[PDB]
Design a binder for this molecule. Structure first.
Ligand SMILES: CNC(=O)c1cccn(Cc2ccccc2)c1=O
Length: 115
């Protein structure tokens, strides 16, 4: 059987998540699609610096599995993903410019939460 329907606030969160994964934002969202493969990227200090990795595929799996009990829990994972990028990478890195752009998409639409 299916999972019960997302709450109204979590429907809005799922909408945002679909947008962040959509071809619309692919030019700057792609680094966030899958877990950072630290070994593949040569980032052999990544897991010493980032204790709680997060990425959009993990957020999608957690939404599908009803792991998130409210919008706040969802938003915390999306912000963790951005914070990890801002912690690990120097502020003038191309990936940080991409994070700032995708976070602007996220924060402005998250602000339109129904209540
Ligand atoms: C969330 N991703 C990262 O923190 C990350 C750190 C270092 C390198 N890369 C690859 C990359 C992306 C974009 C431009 C250049 C290189 C990452 O994705």
């Amino acid at each position: 059987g299916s999972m019960g329907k997302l709450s109204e606030q979590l429907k809005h969160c799922n909408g945002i998540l679909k947008e962040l994964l959509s071809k619309k934002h692919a030019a700057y969202a792609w680094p966030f699609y899958k877990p950072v493969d630290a070994s593949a990227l040569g980032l052999h200090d990544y897991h010493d610096i980032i204790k709680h990795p997060m990425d959009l595929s993990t957020v999608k799996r957690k939404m599908e599995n009803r792991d998130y009990r409210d919008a706040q829990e969802f938003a915390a994972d999306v912000r963790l993903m951005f914070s990890n990028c801002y912690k690990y990478n120097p502020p003038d890195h191309d990936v940080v410019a991409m994070a700032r752009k995708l976070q602007d998409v996220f924060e402005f639409r998250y602000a339109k939460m129904p209540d």
